């Protein structure tokens, strides 16, 4: 890949007419106003001027107040001098270097460079490329050494200016055109335009980690400043959307103004939420995302027609067909037969999603190791200045602030304001303006920042479209139910794309049109909002907790008013803490007093409870009530009682309407009498019905995010501020009392007093963990119970009505369908409508282990005899009555028999999608199938039956998806696209059933899928099968993943499945190897089948190094030896194997009874080994001075019974080698605990006996534990129903 060039320059560098020009900006078109401009890279210009278009000079002065939004820094003198301009320029170069220095950043820039605006728009002649517009070109003025000045023009993508009036609020806008006295944006209907950014690198926003999950290193909270490179990248994402003509301007989230506690902001564009990414993207309901997608599809279709029937350009020196090739590439159009450009919907979906959803602030932060806010509604604090971005000791172009050599990389410490105090300065107070609200009590007025208020979305933010009638026919198109795109996929795509060399930018001067700059929308206010309240609010309660700045003895009071009035009194709600801190001189009991404070704080702050009536909330912190003045009438002393009788809704200031209007039943308008069209219409209908459940669930979730979750988030913040106040006050009291303390031990105790203050903070941090859990669980619980309950109510009724409509249509068309088809329809439809769609509460590069963990989107585990998804995505798992449990790899596994009740169904969570849009994916699981008898191979060898399937369940057919199937001794992987085309791996198992993978042994399956190459089947980490899958279309699989024997004609067939798991990428051999090994442990020893090894269980012994041999006994008291096992061969069926269950049976017993009551044999357990013979157990050991080949290989004896002769029989069952084999080693000790060696064999001849491999113990093996093949490795084989000798 060709590196992206970033140009270098000083502001004072002479114009060169290449990288440094005199530009006439778009909104100065034809006015002859020029500014020095600098080409940072292809298609991107920097103009180090304040963005003044549409403003007046007073706009640049700090106002007294703001109308709305977060705090704003004004500075009219910013970016005025040449040295300022140079500093700006040098900073922007550095930021562009930072961005390109990471492949994710490189991908973003590459995408922006090549997304050239279309040479025309909706109001062009539609047959001719038009460069004569300020939407696509800017004029420049070029001076010759001779003295001639020519005015020409350049096409560009992006012009970046310095900031407007507000430094700390960056903006991106497209060029507007005035047509028919109306504002038209080509960047909004497919074409794109020049995009203009106003940007400031040095005045950055701040945020905190208050509501974030805990880490394993830190539990305390901090404020962070943002990295300007990420701020820039966030703006570039908006630019990208504009270039693709996909700027949103329709469905905004409008803040309610109903109440005084509600946050004032400009409406939030849907596009801002998409740019930010993560869970907040779901604030836009799926029906709206669909409306936006449909709009852009239409826009792109219209652009395909325009580009096809283009004839010429206003500029004759442009190459129309060369521009026609960038555009084909840009819009991912295909060519017709006639050479017309057409939309391929598959390609559109990939392109659209990648642009709207692909790059996000959250994703980019992770790639760059830059800390971002976790929530779009997370707390913003005052902005700060970064004065020294150009100093590599503070900020460099590979690591930003988070520099590894300063130990600032770990946990974004370089952005942490507690730590990196060198990197930032507080802004000048005279430049900082806020939206303040005064609260006056009837003459104390407190000032609340707009930031401290709660965002509540107004009802008109939310769609009602899912409630409206929906018409189903055969022509009915399936809508996408997921609109997302991984940055991971973009990067992969990028690395697989070749360079695109743009044509010349230069064009003819812009002469047409008027340079209408939209008027600045001033946030200046000359008033502050002021309210009188009767009763104390949350804000009085918080403010009452604030300590004075001036050093004095502080006391605590349980009275808010008392604290509001007195500057030395702090409101508290920890009565024991209060009692203790209010105490006077302790004299010599001072240290114990400080200890006592810490103890009381610990007990009081750690209070937690549960209420049965709120059964899915694990942690209730009772003191929230008195801390924030959350009180219910009649329960003034009883918050827990209040919560018990109200539910979590008690915690909400704004109580939303949660009941929902009726959902119109689906309707059918289909006249066709063709059977194929009727069935299609039914299939369409069933899908549409599913889509309704999803749409409504998503709408409710959107409303919850914008009206409910915001409040619970605020409660978290409020409680954090309260606890912070409490800790601060206590610290000040301890500090004050320590100061005036006189005692002989003052100096000596200084450390402990400091440790105790630290412990205070720790306990407060732990309380905050509880509070965060409380609010998260209360929020989820309100969504999942109260809100989604109402949805279900209406959806159940929708289902009933919709079922009637469908049954009507089938009855009316019954003569065209047929009685056999009609019976299937009936039972199918009854099944479908007798099961609701569940609601999922999804969660949504260190090393390989991390990569395996992060790319897992489903993971079935069994706990407490229950199968569930442990991935975090929270897919619902339904276990049917005859799904059975057996021993697994780690705990228990799933056992499926050939009946209808033997079934496990996974309903994938709402937001997971691992194999659409041609996404790469891997599926893995442990599998155990019985050795198929010769008889069943004859009867059923050609009967292909699935065991796992995602394949879409239509009314009368099975559609797109994947399946695992078996057919005799073949394991089959099938991919099916939405056209019915398939790709398959057929793995033919080994004929030697002792070594075979489908013969009663736990084996690890891994199937990777690379949509641009092939599907690969691995067993035990080894590649076994491959199929090219290139050319296969889109996979649109069922929501359900079904584990079940499907179409199996053998009533006795069964399978076991463990650790079923899906990854959202194609794993590479190293990853699979690591995945495979990660399941293998030495702790529990294994039998031959892969099950845990057990005491008091009969096992046949087989040596690994000689697996065709059985162990035999010469006689009681005597030695053991190897002989060939009887064998089975079947040429017809191409199967053979050494027969099992012949030869000596052994039993393992604990050497001495211990405090374990399970019967699992663990590695390192002391054992006695016995032979079961003549319905007796005979101990295996070595007699003292017994025969031993060359005095080293001790010959083992069975039931040796010679009086006065010590018999050594203490063994250790151990896993010392070969983790991938289900084999065991046995170590024998003498009575002085000296090793007599590992149990193996030695070739020899005793007396008249034939030459034999004789069982021994020998220390020789201990020098060979890394060898590939060792005679000390033993299989333990118990009789098993899965293996019967033929």
- Provide the binding-site residues for Na ion, judged by CB under 5 A: 87-88, 277, 563, 569
Q: Considering the complex, state which of residue 362 and residue 1228 has its C-beta at the smaller distance from Na ion.
A: 362
Residue nearest to Na ion (CB): 88
| Smallest distance from Cl ion to CB 1202, Å | 8
| Smallest distance from Cl ion to CB 1116, Å | 14
- 1162 vs 1084: CA distance, rounded Å: 5
Say if residues 224 and 207 touch (Cβ distance below 8 Å): yes
What residue 9 binds from Na ion, Cl ion, none (CB within 5 to 8 A, per partner kind)? none
| Smallest distance from Na ion to CB 362, Å | 7
CA proximity to 462, closest of 793, 787, 798: 787
The CA–CA distances, whole Å, from 270 to 72, 283, 975, 1055, 1072 equal 23, 8, 36, 48, 40
Q: Which of residues 52-91 bind Cl ion (CB under 5 A)?
A: none
Q: Considering the complex, state which of residue 340 and residue 1187 has its C-beta at the smaller distance from Cl ion.
A: 1187
| Smallest distance from Na ion to CB 49, Å | 12
What residue 413 binds from Na ion, Cl ion, none (CB within 5 to 8 A, per partner kind)? none
Residue 105 pairs in a beta bridge with: none
Q: Considering the complex, state which of residue 573 and residue 1208 has its C-beta at the smaller distance from Cl ion.
A: 1208
Residue 1062 CA, distance from chain mean position: 14
What residue 289 binds from Cl ion, Na ion, none (CB within 5 to 8 A, per partner kind)? none
Say if residues 1252 and 1245 touch (Cβ distance below 8 Å): yes
Q: Which of residues 1150-1189 bind Cl ion (CB under 5 A)?
A: 1187
263's tokens: 């946050």
Q: Considering the complex, state which of residue 87 and residue 435 has its C-beta at the smaller distance from Na ion.
A: 87
Which residues in 802-827 are b (16+ Cβ under 10 Å) and which e?
bbebbeebbeebeeebeeebeeebee
What residue 1142 binds from Cl ion, Na ion, none (CB within 5 to 8 A, per partner kind)? none
| Smallest distance from Cl ion to CB 1239, Å | 18
Q: Considering the complex, state which of residue 280 and residue 1058 has its C-beta at the smaller distance from Na ion.
A: 280
Residue nearest to Cl ion (CB): 1187
| Smallest distance from Cl ion to CB 1253, Å | 19
| Smallest distance from Cl ion to CB 1249, Å | 14
- At 1089, give phi and psi (nearest 5°): -85, -15
Q: Considering the complex, state which of residue 703 and residue 1252 has its C-beta at the smaller distance from Cl ion.
A: 1252
In sequence order, which residues have a C-beta less than 8 Å from that of residue 360 and are 6 or more positions away? 237, 274, 275, 276, 277, 278, 281, 487
What residue 912 binds from Cl ion, Na ion, none (CB within 5 to 8 A, per partner kind)? none
- 757 vs 734: CA distance, rounded Å: 8
| Smallest distance from Na ion to CB 90, Å | 8
Helix (H, G, I), strand (E, B) or coil at 1261: helix
Q: Considering the complex, state which of residue 95 and residue 1256 has its C-beta at the smaller distance from Na ion.
A: 95
Q: Considering the complex, state which of residue 228 and residue 656 has its C-beta at the smaller distance from Na ion.
A: 228
- At 1166, give phi and psi (nearest 5°): -80, 135
What residue 39 binds from Cl ion, Na ion, none (CB within 5 to 8 A, per partner kind)? none
| Smallest distance from Na ion to CB 1167, Å | 54
In sequence order, which residues have a C-beta less than 8 Å from that of residue 52 and are 6 or more positions away? 164
What residue 962 binds from Na ion, Cl ion, none (CB within 5 to 8 A, per partner kind)? none
| Smallest distance from Na ion to CB 360, Å | 5
What residue 88 binds from Cl ion, Na ion, none (CB within 5 to 8 A, per partner kind)? Na ion
What residue 96 binds from Cl ion, Na ion, none (CB within 5 to 8 A, per partner kind)? none
**DSSP letter assigned to residue 1078:** T
What residue 925 binds from Na ion, Cl ion, none (CB within 5 to 8 A, per partner kind)? none
Q: Considering the complex, state which of residue 1112 and residue 1187 has its C-beta at the smaller distance from Cl ion.
A: 1187
**Count of residues interacting with Cl ion (CB under 5 A):** 1
- 1037 vs 233: CA distance, rounded Å: 35
Q: Considering the complex, state which of residue 925 and residue 1182 has its C-beta at the smaller distance from Cl ion.
A: 1182
| Smallest distance from Na ion to CB 366, Å | 11
- 249 vs 267: CA distance, rounded Å: 11
What residue 563 binds from Cl ion, Na ion, none (CB within 5 to 8 A, per partner kind)? Na ion
Where is 65: in which H helix or E strand?
strand 65-66
Q: Considering the complex, state which of residue 427 and residue 665 has its C-beta at the smaller distance from Na ion.
A: 427
Say if residues 1251 and 1266 touch (Cβ distance below 8 Å): no
Q: Which of residues 1183-1222 bind Cl ion (CB under 5 A)?
A: 1187
Q: Considering the complex, state which of residue 1020 and residue 1187 has its C-beta at the smaller distance from Cl ion.
A: 1187
| Smallest distance from Cl ion to CB 1118, Å | 9
What residue 685 binds from Na ion, Cl ion, none (CB within 5 to 8 A, per partner kind)? none
Q: Considering the complex, state which of residue 755 and residue 1115 has its C-beta at the smaller distance from Cl ion.
A: 1115
| Smallest distance from Cl ion to CB 1231, Å | 18
What residue 1092 binds from Na ion, Cl ion, none (CB within 5 to 8 A, per partner kind)? none
- 142 vs 144: CA distance, rounded Å: 7
In sequence order, which residues have a C-beta less than 8 Å from that of residue 723 and are 6 or more positions away? 605, 764, 767, 768, 771
- 835 vs 1039: CA distance, rounded Å: 13
The CA–CA distances, whole Å, from 660 to 192, 787, 794 equal 39, 9, 7
Q: Considering the complex, state which of residue 1187 and residue 1221 has its C-beta at the smaller distance from Cl ion.
A: 1187
| Smallest distance from Cl ion to CB 1207, Å | 12
- 724 vs 717: CA distance, rounded Å: 10
Give the number of residues written for the chain: 1286
CA proximity to 663, closest of 632, 700, 714, 702: 700
| Smallest distance from Cl ion to CB 1158, Å | 38
Q: How many helices (H) and strands (E) does the chain have?
A: 24, 64
What residue 1209 binds from Na ion, Cl ion, none (CB within 5 to 8 A, per partner kind)? none
Where is 924: in which H helix or E strand?
strand 921-928
Rounded to 10°, the helix 361-368/103-114 angle is: 140
What residue 169 binds from Na ion, Cl ion, none (CB within 5 to 8 A, per partner kind)? none
In sequence order, which residues have a C-beta less than 8 Å from that of residue 826 and are 6 or more positions away? none
| Smallest distance from Na ion to CB 639, Å | 24
Query: Measured at the alpha carbon of residue 730, what is the angle toward residues 727 and 731, in degrees to the nearest 5?
Result: 85
| Smallest distance from Na ion to CB 202, Å | 5
417's tokens: 């304001």
What residue 87 binds from Cl ion, Na ion, none (CB within 5 to 8 A, per partner kind)? Na ion
What residue 993 binds from Na ion, Cl ion, none (CB within 5 to 8 A, per partner kind)? none
Q: Considering the complex, state which of residue 911 and residue 1253 has its C-beta at the smaller distance from Na ion.
A: 911
In sequence order, which residues have a C-beta less than 8 Å from that of residue 475 and are 6 or more positions away? none
Q: Considering the complex, state which of residue 1070 and residue 1184 has its C-beta at the smaller distance from Cl ion.
A: 1184
Q: Considering the complex, state which of residue 1187 and residue 1285 has its C-beta at the smaller distance from Cl ion.
A: 1187
- 494 vs 488: CA distance, rounded Å: 10
* Alpha helix (H) residue ranges in 283-360: 286-308, 320-331, 345-353
Say if residues 82 and 35 touch (Cβ distance below 8 Å): no
Residues that bind Cl ion (CB under 5 A): 1187
């Amino acid at each position: 890949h060709m590196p992206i060039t970033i140009n270098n320059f000083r502001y004072s560098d002479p114009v060169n007419n290449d990288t440094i020009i005199m530009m006439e900006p778009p909104y100065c078109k034809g006015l002859d106003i020029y500014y020095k401009a600098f080409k940072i890279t292809d298609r991107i210009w920097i103009v180090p001027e304040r963005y003044e278009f549409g403003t007046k000079p007073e706009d640049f002065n700090p106002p007294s107040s703001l109308i709305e939004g977060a705090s704003e820094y004004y500075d009219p003198n910013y970016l005025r001098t040449d040295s300022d301009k140079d500093r700006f320029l040098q900073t922007m170069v550095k930021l562009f270097n930072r961005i390109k220095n990471n492949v994710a950043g490189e991908a973003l820039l590459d995408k922006i460079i090549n997304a050239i605006p279309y040479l025309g728009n909706s109001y062009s002649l539609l047959d001719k490329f038009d460069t004569n517009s300020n939407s696509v070109s800017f004029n420049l003025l070029e001076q010759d050494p001779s003295g001639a000045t020519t005015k020409s023009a350049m096409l560009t993508n992006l012009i970046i200016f310095g900031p407007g009036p507000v430094l700390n609020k960056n903006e991106v806008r497209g060029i507007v055109l005035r047509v028919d006295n109306k504002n038209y944006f080509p960047c909004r209907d497919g074409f794109g335009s020049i995009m203009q950014m106003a940007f400031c690198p040095e005045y950055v926003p701040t945020f905190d980690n208050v509501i974030e999950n805990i880490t394993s290193l830190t539990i305390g909270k901090s404020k962070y400043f943002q990295d300007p490179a990420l701020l820039l990248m966030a703006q570039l994402i908006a630019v990208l959307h504009g270039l693709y003509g996909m700027q949103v301007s329709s469905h905004e989230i409008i803040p309610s103004k109903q109440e005084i506690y509600m946050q004032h902001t400009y409406p939030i564009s849907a596009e801002e939420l998409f740019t930010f990414g993560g869970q907040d993207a779901n604030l836009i309901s799926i029906d709206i995302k669909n409306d936006l997608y449909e709009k852009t599809l239409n826009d792109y279709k219209a652009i395909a027609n325009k580009l096809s029937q283009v004839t010429s350009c206003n500029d004759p020196n442009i190459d129309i067909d060369s521009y026609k090739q960038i555009y084909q590439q840009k819009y991912q159009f295909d060519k017709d037969s006639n050479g017309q450009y057409i939309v391929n919907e598959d390609k559109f979906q990939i392109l659209y999603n990648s642009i709207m959803y692909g790059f996000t602030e959250i994703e980019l932060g992770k790639k760059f190791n830059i800390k971002t806010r976790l929530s779009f509604f997370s707390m913003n604090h005052d902005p700060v200045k970064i004065p020294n971005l150009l100093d590599d000791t503070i900020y460099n172009d590979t690591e930003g602030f988070n520099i590894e050599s300063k130990d600032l990389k770990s946990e974004y410490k370089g952005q942490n304001m507690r730590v990196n105090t060198n990197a930032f300065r507080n802004v000048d107070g005279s430049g900082l303006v806020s939206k303040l609200i005064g609260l006056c009590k009837k003459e104390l007025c407190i000032k609340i920042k707009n930031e401290d208020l709660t965002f509540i979305a107004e009802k008109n933010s939310f769609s009602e479209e899912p409630f409206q009638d929906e018409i189903v026919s055969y022509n009915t198109k399936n809508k996408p139910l997921n609109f997302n795109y991984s940055l991971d996929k973009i990067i992969v795509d990028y690395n697989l794309q070749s360079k695109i060399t743009l044509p010349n930018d230069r064009t003819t001067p812009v002469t047409k049109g008027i340079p209408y700059a939209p008027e600045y929308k001033s946030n200046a206010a000359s008033t502050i909002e002021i309210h009188n309240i009767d009763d104390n609010t949350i804000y009085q309660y918080l403010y009452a907790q604030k300590s004075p700045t001036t050093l004095q003895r502080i006391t605590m009071t349980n009275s808010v008013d008392d604290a509001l009035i007195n500057s030395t009194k702090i409101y508290s709600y920890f009565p024991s803490v209060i009692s203790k801190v209010n105490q006077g001189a302790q004299g010599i009991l001072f240290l114990q007093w400080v200890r006592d404070i810490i103890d009381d704080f610990t007990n009081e702050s750690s209070q937690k409870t549960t209420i049965d009536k709120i059964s899915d909330v694990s942690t209730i912190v009772p003191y929230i009530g008195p801390a924030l003045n959350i009180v219910k009438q009649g329960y003034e002393g009883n918050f827990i009682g209040a919560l018990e009788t109200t539910g979590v809704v008690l915690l909400l200031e704004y109580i939303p309407e949660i009941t929902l209007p009726v959902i119109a039943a689906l309707s059918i308008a289909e006249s066709s009498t063709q059977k194929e069209k009727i069935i299609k219409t039914i299939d369409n209908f069933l899908e549409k019905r599913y889509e309704k459940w999803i749409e409504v669930y998503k709408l409710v979730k959107a409303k919850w995010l914008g009206t409910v979750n915001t409040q619970f988030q605020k409660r978290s913040y409020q409680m954090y501020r309260s606890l912070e106040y409490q800790v601060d006050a206590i610290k000040k009291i301890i500090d004050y009392e320590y100061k005036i303390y006189s005692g002989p031990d003052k100096e000596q105790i200084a450390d402990e007093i400091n440790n105790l203050k630290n412990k205070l903070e720790e306990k407060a941090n732990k309380a905050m963990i509880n509070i965060n859990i409380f609010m998260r669980e209360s929020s989820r619980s309100f969504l999942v119970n109260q809100m989604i309950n109402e949805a279900k109510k209406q959806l159940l009724e929708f289902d009933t009505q919709s079922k009637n409509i469908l049954m009507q249509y089938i009855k009316a068309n019954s003569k065209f369908i047929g009685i056999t088809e009609l019976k299937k329809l009936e039972s199918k439809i009854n099944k479908v409508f007798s099961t609701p769609i569940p609601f999922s509460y999804s969660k949504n590069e260190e090393d390989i282990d991390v990569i395996l963990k992060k790319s897992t989107i489903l993971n079935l585990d069994i706990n407490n005899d229950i199968i569930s998804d442990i991935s975090g995505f929270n897919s619902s798992v339904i276990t049917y009555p005859d799904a059975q449990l057996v021993p697994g790899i780690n705990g228990k596994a799933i056992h499926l028999v050939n009946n209808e009740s033997s079934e496990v169904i996974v309903h994938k969570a709402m937001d997971i999608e691992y194999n659409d849009m041609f996404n790469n994916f891997t599926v893995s699981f442990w599998l155990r199938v019985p050795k198929v008898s010769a008889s069943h191979l004859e009867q059923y060898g050609t009967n292909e039956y699935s065991i796992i399937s995602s394949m879409k369940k239509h009314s009368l057919s099975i559609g797109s998806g994947w399946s695992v199937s078996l057919k005799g001794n073949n394991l089959i992987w099938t991919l099916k696209d939405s056209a019915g085309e398939v790709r398959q791996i057929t793995f033919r198992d080994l004929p030697d059933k002792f070594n075979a993978y489908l013969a009663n042994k736990w084996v690890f399956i891994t199937i990777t899928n690379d949509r641009l190459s092939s599907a690969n089947l691995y067993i035990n980490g080894v590649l076994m099968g491959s199929a090219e899958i290139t050319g296969l279309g889109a996979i649109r699989e069922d929501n359900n993943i079904t584990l079940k024997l499907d179409r199996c004609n053998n009533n006795n067939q069964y399978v076991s499945i463990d650790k079923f798991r899906i990854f959202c990428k194609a794993l590479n051999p190293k990853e699979i190897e690591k995945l495979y090994t990660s399941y293998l442990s030495i702790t529990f020893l294994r039998d031959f089948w892969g099950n845990p090894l057990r005491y008091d269980t009969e096992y046949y012994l087989i040596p690994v190094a000689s697996s065709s041999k059985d162990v035999q006994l010469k006689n009681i008291t005597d030695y053991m030896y190897l002989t060939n096992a009887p064998s089975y061969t079947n040429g017809k069926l191409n199967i053979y194997y050494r027969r099992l269950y012949n030869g000596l049976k052994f039993i393992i017993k604990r050497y001495t009874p211990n405090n374990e009551i399970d019967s699992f044999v663990k590695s390192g357990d002391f054992i006695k080994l016995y032979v079961s013979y003549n319905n007796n157990e005979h101990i295996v050991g070595y007699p003292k001075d017994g025969n031993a080949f060359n005095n080293l290989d001790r010959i083992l004896r069975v039931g040796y019974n010679a009086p006065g002769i010590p018999l050594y029989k203490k063994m250790e069952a151990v896993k010392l080698r070969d983790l991938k084999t289900y084999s065991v080693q046995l170590k024998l000790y003498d009575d002085k605990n000296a090793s007599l060696g590992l149990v193996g064999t030695h070739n020899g001849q005793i007396g008249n006996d034939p030459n034999r491999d004789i069982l021994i113990a020998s220390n020789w093996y201990f020098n060979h534990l890394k060898d590939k093949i060792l005679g000390c490795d033993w299989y333990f084989v118990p009789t098993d129903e899965g293996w019967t000798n033929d």
